[PDB]
A = this chain, B = another copy of it.
Amino acid sequence: DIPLADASKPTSIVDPVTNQEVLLECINSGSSHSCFFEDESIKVYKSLNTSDFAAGKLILKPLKEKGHQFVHMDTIAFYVIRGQIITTLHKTSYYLTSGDYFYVPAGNGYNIRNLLNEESVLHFTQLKND
């Protein structure tokens, strides 16, 4: 026994500051997303998005290179759900597969290349710093 709630509506949670209950979106269920971006090479879904962080999936299209990007004051953590990729941080690059993790430390550049003729999927967590 546990009654369930509607995952599409906000949750009543505790604010540590007020010590009072506030409504907040803490669930992202099904095909809800905050944001979507698509180019020649990638798709990006942001499923969780707050002022502190964001999380979602990065999809590398068949045999495509994400393209070197510089991250600023933020830090991005990745987990490879399914795929075979080559990741470059700064100037060094590594072979990675389903199950591997990596992060991009603030003030660095990274690139990712899809080795498979199928989609590669990565979970990402973006830590917003100022």
Which B residues are CB-close (under 8 A) to A7? 94-96, 100
In-complex Cβ contact of A89 among B4, B26, B96, B106 (8 A): B26
Do B92 and A12 have beta carbons less than 8 Å apart?
A: yes
Which residues in window 89-103 of A have CB below 8 A to B?
89-97, 99-103
Which B residues are CB-close (under 8 A) to A95? 4, 7
Count the copies. 2
**Which interface class (under 10, 10 to 19, 20 to 34, 35 or more) fits A?**
35 or more
Which B residues are CB-close (under 8 A) to A101? 27-29, 47-48, 55-56
Cβ-closest 4 pairs across A and B: A16-B107, A28-B101, A125-B125, A29-B100
